[PDB]
Amino acid sequence: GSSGSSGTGVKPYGCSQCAKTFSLKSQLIVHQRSHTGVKPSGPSSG
Ligand SMILES: [Zn+2]
């Protein structure tokens, strides 16, 4: 089996793009700078 839904608790600093949260703002402020910029392979003649 797998444990879960055991007691509520939602950190104040959480990311929307993903389901990853953090306790320290510094961690988020920096993390947020991950869902932007570098893009995955796309155009061949680009
Ligand atoms: Zn994120």
UniProtKB/Swiss-Prot annotation:
Signal sequence extent: none
Transmembrane segments: none
Induction note: Down-regulated during erythroid differentiation by GATA1. Down-regulated by HTLV-1 Tax through the CREB/ATF pathway. Up-regulated by the regulator of nonsense transcript UPF1. Up-regulated by the cyclic AMP-dependent transcription factor ATF4.
Subunit structure: Interacts (via the KRAB domain) with TRIM28 (via the RBCC domain); the interaction increases ZNF268 nuclear localization activity. Isoform 2 interacts with CHUK and IKBKB; the interaction is further increased in a TNF-alpha-dependent manner. Forms a ternary complex with TBK1 and SETD4; the interaction between SETD4 and TBK1 is ZNF268-dependent and leads to TBK1 monomethylation.
Zn finger region (C2H2-type): 13-35
Protein localization: Cytoplasm
Note on domains (UniProt): The KRAB domain functions to reinforce the nuclear localization of isoform 1 in addition to its transcription repression activity.
Function of the molecule: Involved in the regulation of antiviral interferon signaling. During viral infection, recruits SETD4 to TBK1, leading to TBK1 monomethylation, which is critical for the assembly of TBK1 complex and IRF3 signaling.
Name by which UniProt lists this protein: Zinc finger protein 268
Native species: Homo sapiens
Sequence similarity: Belongs to the krueppel C2H2-type zinc-finger protein family.
Highest taxon listed in the record's lineage: Eukaryota
Gene encoding the protein: ZNF268
Tissue distribution: Overexpressed in ovarian cancer tissues compared to normal ovarian tissues. Isoform 1 and isoform 2 are expressed in squamous epithelium tissues. Isoform 2 is overexpressed in squamous cervical cancer (at protein level). Expressed in blood cells. Isoform 1 is expressed in pancreas, lung, skeletal muscle, heart, placenta, liver, kidney and brain. Isoform 2 expressed in chronic lymphocytic leukemia (CLL) and several tumor cell lines. Isoform 3 is expressed in several tumor cells. Isoform 5 is expressed in fetal liver and several tumor cells.
